[PDB]
Design a protein around this ligand. Structure first.
Ligand SMILES: [Ca+2]
Length: 523
């Protein structure tokens, strides 16, 4: 601008305040693809994914949130959990659409199963049905000689892809052959990745490894098609990643020095959270912990690659237990409970500086629920990452509760509830009378019969730049439709949109959402 007191240009009054596109108000729906309806026992990246995206577009939503897309562990009672993944980078092959594979010529229609029970994902039977079909398709692709073969080759050879995929495939092949509970007990040449032993693995387990890679290509291609379609409809996809990875994975076995392990590869300390006046005992998660000191020395290369893959899949993503980047609870690996442990200093902002330098700008959402400390808030603010507000947590304390709308801020993501909460209707049904009174009063004395509308509107009308509603709440569903109960080992991650509900029959629901998005400037 000119010197103080001097003339501005004649057109000064046209220099109107700028609206940063990153600040655009948006609304989204939380719906994990396993929850899509259809005849094959689990939702997939096929015809229903596109019907869903059409419905989202009709509803005026510009975001779709999913849970992690990784292959869930099947080795306990974590049945189907997106948060107990077998690998940090691979896609869940159960999400691969049998119909799209028929379109590709990799499966024959006659090979597809007769329609399976539709109400709920049965994680105990679904792999036995779908795995052989995905394998058949992968084998057909491997023996083919056209455009898809060429694409498979480009995929396998891509330096970003190969940085995790080769290790993931060899890990799975060895796991299949050796079949111990963990790699800690593998024969030393395989445990310690002797060059000759790995060469021998590819010779003896060639087919397994080739098929594993082909399956990951099939996932990649289907996911890309979905993401491209979403983008065509003005819809971004928000993913999710746990801060930690599991011990028995290629992530650890192929990158041992990234983790705090002893000389025999056993974790020295493991993840958890301490007691916070709850049942005397805290929570023992048991994941290996990162050697953040070692990581800083190479510019956080392992974390950079993890982020690269996340951006290959998602437009933006939440990191669970974001507080772990500021401070993390460490339990000696011998302990059977979380009581005995210490808080350790996390990597802080330098991790995010290195990510920025390597990968560029990313919308990372900080999961910041529960008791968090001041350093966590300062870290989050320092990288301009939005935290969370969850309306189902807002009404049981006092007016300073950060989840209450009058306490929201613009750079934040507001939910009615997440996959960890009951549905609005389910939550209401078990809510104590005193809290019910408080909710109704807060929401301008609305009727109990309109609680769902009240909470949905409370989210949409918030100043928070992103509002997310679970699909269950759009559908008016109760506790039988809850995705996860955090205390538990069974019945989780299995909810599906009922067979009788189809996206083409949800025009009324889309209009109802679109109208409030219009009113509250999210359209
Ligand atoms: Ca096994």
């Amino acid at each position: 601008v000119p010197a103080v007191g001097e003339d501005f240009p004649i057109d000064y009054a046209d220099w109107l305040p700028k609206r940063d596109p990153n600040d655009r108000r948006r609304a989204g729906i939380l719906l994990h693809p396993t929850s899509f309806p259809g005849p094959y026992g689990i939702g997939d990246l096929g015809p229903q994914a596109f019907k869903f995206l059409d419905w989202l577009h009709l509803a005026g939503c510009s975001l779709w949130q999913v849970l992690p897309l990784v292959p869930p562990g099947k080795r306990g009672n974590e049945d189907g959990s997106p948060y107990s993944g077998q690998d940090a980078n691979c896609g869940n092959t159960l999400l691969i659409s049998l119909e799209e594979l028929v379109d590709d010529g990799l499966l024959k229609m006659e090979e597809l199963p007769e329609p399976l029970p539709t109400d709920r994902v049965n994680y105990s039977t679904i792999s036995e049905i779908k795995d052989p079909l995905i394998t058949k398709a992968a084998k057909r692709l491997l023996s083919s000689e056209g455009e898809l073969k060429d694409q498979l080759e480009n995929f396998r050879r891509d330096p970003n892809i190969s940085s995790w995929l080769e290790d993931a495939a060899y890990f799975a092949a060895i796991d299949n052959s050796v079949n111990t509970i963990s790699w800690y007990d593998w024969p030393e040449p395989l445990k310690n990745r002797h060059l000759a032993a790995l060469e021998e693995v590819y010779q003896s387990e060639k087919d397994f490894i080739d098929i594993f890679i082909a399956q990951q290509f099939l996932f990649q291609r289907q996911w890309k098609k979905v993401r491209d379609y979403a983008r065509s409809k003005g819809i971004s996809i928000m993913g999710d990643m746990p801060i930690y990875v599991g011990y028995h994975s290629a992530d650890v076995w192929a990158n041992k020095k990234q983790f705090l392990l002893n000389r025999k590869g056993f974790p020295l300390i493991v993840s958890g959270v301490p007691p916070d006046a709850f049942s005397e005992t805290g929570q023992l998660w048991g994941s290996p912990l990162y050697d953040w000191k070692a990581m800083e020395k190479d510019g956080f290369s392992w974390w950079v690659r993890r982020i690269q893959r996340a951006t290959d899949l998602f437009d933006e993503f939440r990191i669970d237990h974001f507080r772990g980047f500021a401070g993390f609870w460490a339990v000696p690996s011998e302990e059977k409970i979380a009581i005995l442990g210490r808080w350790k200093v996390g990597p802080g902002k330098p991790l995010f500086d290195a990510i920025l330098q390597a990968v560029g700008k990313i919308n990372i959402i900080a999961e910041d629920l529960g008791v968090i400390t001041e350093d966590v808030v300062q870290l989050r603010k320092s990288i301009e990452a939005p935290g969370m507000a969850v309306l189902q947590f807002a009404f049981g304390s006092d007016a300073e509760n950060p989840h209450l709308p009058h306490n929201h801020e613009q750079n934040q993501v507001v939910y009615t509830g997440t996959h960890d909460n009951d549905t609005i209707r389910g939550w209401w049904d078990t809510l104590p009378q005193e809290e019910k009174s408080n909710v109704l009063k807060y929401l301008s004395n609305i009727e109990e019969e309109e609680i769902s509308r009240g909470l949905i509107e409370g989210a949409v009308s918030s100043v928070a730049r992103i509002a997310i509603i679970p699909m269950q709440d759009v559908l008016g569903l109760g506790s039988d439709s809850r995705m996860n109960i955090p205390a538990t080992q069974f019945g989780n991650w299995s909810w599906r949109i009922p067979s009788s509900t189809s996206f083409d029959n949800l025009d009324a629901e889309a209009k109802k959402l679109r109208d409030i998005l219009a009113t509250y400037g999210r359209l």
